[PDB]
Amino acid sequence: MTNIEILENMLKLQQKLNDETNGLNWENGYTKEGKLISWRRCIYMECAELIDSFTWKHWKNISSLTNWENVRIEIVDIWHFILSLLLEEYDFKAIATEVNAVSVFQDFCKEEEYPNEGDIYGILNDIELIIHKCSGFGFNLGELLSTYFTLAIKCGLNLEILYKTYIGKNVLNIFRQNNGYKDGSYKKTWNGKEDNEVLAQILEQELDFDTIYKKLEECYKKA
């Protein structure tokens, strides 16, 4: 697949997931159940979650090494919400072509970097830039995307890694919606392992959408 085709495929999957999660015409701002949708909030909130993967707190557990696998899933979570924002702002090929034209995107398709603990305050500054942009109004989507890819590169992702991990988390997101996430009946911890970690384990063995879903269903039945 070309890079544009990868992007198109992600947009298609995001569209489908958002239709299932929110009902059709979620682009107009409300779920079927009448919850207000703010992709700006989803983004800055997920950024805060990403910040918590690092030892940013000067007063608490001040020596802990980063779990970069956790960081990778967070970067993927943010990407789900950025895709959603693009879709809302509103022809997947057209949007993919625009994303592909962001200058840093070419750098993002290269071989990945291996970050270390030395890189955390730089990473944190980049996340803070995104939180600032998305918590304000009238920002430029292209600038958002640039900053995001710069961050993703710092965190050791490239397009290949993003796509693989995105496909997996997209499955888990669909799974949750089919299993009571909205009504609060879903159980997130399965015999002591968080669903995201069951997923991370599954993503060690090169599977398609439907097979990932089956493996999740099988682990969940044991909860």
Ligand X SMILES: O=c1ccn([C@H]2C[C@H](O)[C@@H](COP(=O)(O)NP(=O)(O)OP(=O)(O)O)O2)c(=O)[nH]1
Binding positions for Mg ion, rule: CB under 5 A: 49, 77
Q: Which of 3, 9, 51, 105 binds its own copies (CB under 8 A)?
A: 51
110 sits near its own copies (criterion: CB under 8 A): no
164 sits near its own copies (criterion: CB under 8 A): no
Q: How far is the CB of 178 from its own copies (least distance, A)?
A: 12
Select from 4-12, 14-22, 130-138, 209-217 the region that touches ligand X (CB under 6 A): 14-22
DSSP labels, the chain: --HHHHHHHHHHHHHHHHHHHH-TTGGGSB-TT-PBP-HHHHHHHHHHHHHTTS---TTSS------HHHHHHHHHHHHHHHHHHHHHH--HHHHHHHHHTSHHHHHHTSPPP---GGGHHHHHHHHHHHHHHHHSSS--HHHHHHHHHHHHHHTT--HHHHHHHHHHHHHHHHHHHTTTTTTT----EETTEEHHHHHHHHGGG---HHHHHHHHHHHHTT-
Q: Which does 165 bind (CB under 5 to 8 A by kind): Mg ion, its own copies, ligand X, none?
A: none
Site size for ligand X, by CB under 6 A? 14
Binding mask 152-191 for ligand X (x = CB under 6 A): -----------------x---x--------------x---
Judged by CB, which is closer to ligand X: 60, or 222? 60
48 sits near its own copies (criterion: CB under 8 A): yes
Which two tokens mark 184?
Answer: 């609060």
Q: Which of 16, 121, 122, 208 binds its own copies (CB under 8 A)?
A: 121
Q: How far is the CB of 194 from ligand X (least distance, A)?
A: 6
